[PDB]
Design a protein around this ligand. Structure first.
Ligand SMILES: NC(=O)C1=CN([C@@H]2O[C@H](COP(=O)(O)OP(=O)(O)OC[C@H]3O[C@@H](n4cnc5c(N)ncnc54)[C@H](OP(=O)(O)O)[C@@H]3O)[C@@H](O)[C@H]2O)C=CC1
Ligand SMILES: NC(=O)C1=CN([C@@H]2O[C@H](COP(=O)(O)OP(=O)(O)OC[C@H]3O[C@@H](n4cnc5c(N)ncnc54)[C@H](OP(=O)(O)O)[C@@H]3O)[C@@H](O)[C@H]2O)C=CC1
Ligand SMILES: COc1ccccc1[C@@H]1N(c2cccc(S(C)(=O)=O)c2)C(=O)C1(C)C
Ligand SMILES: COc1ccccc1[C@@H]1N(c2cccc(S(C)(=O)=O)c2)C(=O)C1(C)C
Lengths: 265, 264
């Protein structure tokens, strides 16, 4: 199977954290493809500027709804309004995250809660809210993760916890949808260091690593989701997907389905 | 090579000790002549286990009843327990919310509770306990599952939390290592265990052979004592091979050289 940019033409897409970074790039690529987009972030001004640009680039439609995704009530209402604006939903790109600084974890419990609320819990709310619309259209979900969601790094404990949680939850949901013959895809995008202004500011003085371009990154996510792939990998090193392949877990998960009573599906 | 003499006179906290694996760990530690402090919600349940612990030969045995849904309790529990024993050598994080096998359909409040009891309370307590573990060069046993390293259906919220534990506590281990803190973190990956809860809940759904809960408890204690990074325990002998994941260990080692050494 090969990606064609006509696959997203006319499709109704939602992009979280669309005001800047990879989300903003994803917004532009979808707009060039002639899709319907509803964007979100906290910054009202930031969204307005991106929505304007999306129209110029050639979006079928384009709207913004501003708010914080630490509010679960907002997260649920956002999906419902997004769906009302576009008349349905075809793709859900859960891309947003709460701010995190690189530091050794030290007596930082209220921060951990906040990270789980924004980086993980809201993802569950929005997927749950959006699922009925994605069932109706046989749609997709883009679950944007990290290398730190598969392997561990110092000075990023709460961030990893959340992204690991995303791998646990959405990999399970994916299987359930598959074994129950529900035609909705879930994509876990494992990303290496990307040259977004927030990331580069953060790794400054601490980490000495080469970043990858944010434009090309945004495109691969959109392609990977559109082609209904289980996982997508994006990193500078070509050794990454092989070292993060984990054939044992794949073997484990396949044979494990025989333990179950098929009557449950 | 482990010897049970090690744990004689040691000061161990065991969460979720009123039944299941935690109760069997409370018994084993008692047989080895340890000082235990046990905790669960059920007060009566803890009284029965503490009495049995004293019979079995515990250096001391106490309990503190309460829910780990509450983070205030979780924190105060460690301070109170630490005072009761006058120190802390080993922390066994074991408790979990009741799990039912079901295709995901829970609202956000159900999912939040799971993460608070299964994950968030583990972080609070570990954080709270750490100064004492630093003082005694102690250990932490974080009880995970195969559901924390692999995805099975009908257990989405459960997996989420166990994955979270790995993500979080693996990190803390490395941080403790690069900062030369002699406090060990053992992640115990367990397969199906013959507890009342597990066996009743898989009934009519999963046809699989369980492993004995008494041995399970011991292998957890042996690992944490010996300061292992991970303890694998499952019926199949192909399990620790399959869940080995050498690429991760390679990744994590080499990637330390990205960091500025002056940060530590
Ligand atoms: N860039 C990198 O080095 C890598 C990134 N990734 C992943 O890629 C994704 C995007 O990262 P990146 O683009 O760099 O992050 P950025 O900081 O560049 O952008 C994140 C977006 O999220 C929004 N946001 C921040 N806080 C909230 C919140 N409270 N509620 C709703 N939206 C919020 C921001 O807008 P606003 O502040 O106005 O609300 C912003 O548009 C993340 O999920 C990350 O985990 C993975 C590996 C590495
Ligand atoms: N049994 C199995 O097949 C498997 C078990 N495991 C792991 O082993 C560990 C123990 O499992 P197991 O012994 O079977 O579980 P059990 O249900 O048998 O025991 C759980 C313990 O935690 C306590 N508990 C339950 N809810 C709460 C809560 N809300 N707040 C505080 N305490 C609570 C219970 O006491 P009370 O209700 O009175 O509070 C009980 O003592 C878990 O971490 C589990 O993930 C891993 C793989 C397989
Ligand atoms: C060389 O790779 C790394 C080394 C140490 C730590 C982190 C990273 C990268 N990185 C990352 C870095 C800074 C900010 C953010 S952000 C915008 O999601 O908050 C994410 C990640 O994720 C990684 C793991 C891909
Ligand atoms: C053959 O093993 C399995 C197959 C599919 C799914 C799950 C399991 C087991 N399971 C488990 C099952 C029921 C109750 C609980 S409990 C007491 O922690 O709530 C835990 C686990 O964990 C496993 C993975 C060890």
């Amino acid at each position: 199977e090969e990606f064609r940019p006509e696959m997203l033409q006319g499709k109704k897409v939602i992009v979280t954290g669309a005001s800047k970074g990879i989300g903003r790039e994803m917004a532009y690529h979808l707009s060039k493809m002639g899709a319907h987009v509803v964007l979100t972030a906290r910054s009202e001004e930031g969204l307005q500027k991106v929505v304007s640009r999306c129209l110029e680039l050639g979006a079928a439609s384009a709207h913004y709804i501003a708010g914080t995704m630490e509010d679960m009530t907002f997260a649920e209402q956002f999906i419902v309004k997004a769906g009302k604006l576009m008349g349905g939903l075809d793709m859900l790109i859960l891309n947003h995250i709460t701010q995190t600084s690189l530091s050794l974890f030290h007596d930082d419990i209220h921060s951990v809660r906040r990270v789980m609320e924004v980086n993980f819990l809201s993802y569950v709310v929005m997927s749950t809210a959006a699922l009925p619309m994605l069932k109706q259209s046989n749609g997709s979900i883009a679950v944007i993760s990290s290398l730190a969601g598969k392997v561990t790094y110092p000075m990023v404990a709460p961030y990893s916890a959340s992204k690991f949680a995303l791998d646990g939850f959405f990999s399970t949901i994916r299987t359930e949808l598959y074994i129950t013959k529900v035609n909705v895809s879930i994509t876990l995008c494992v990303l290496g260091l990307i040259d977004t202004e927030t990331a580069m500011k953060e790794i400054s003085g601490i980490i000495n690593a080469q970043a990858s371009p944010k434009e090309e990154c945004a495109l691969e996510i959109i392609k990977g989701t559109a082609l209904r792939k289980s996982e997508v990998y994006y990193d500078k090193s070509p050794l990454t997907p092989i070292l993060l392949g984990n054939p044992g877990r794949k073997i484990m998960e396949f044979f494990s389905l025989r333990y179950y009573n098929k009557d449950m599906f």
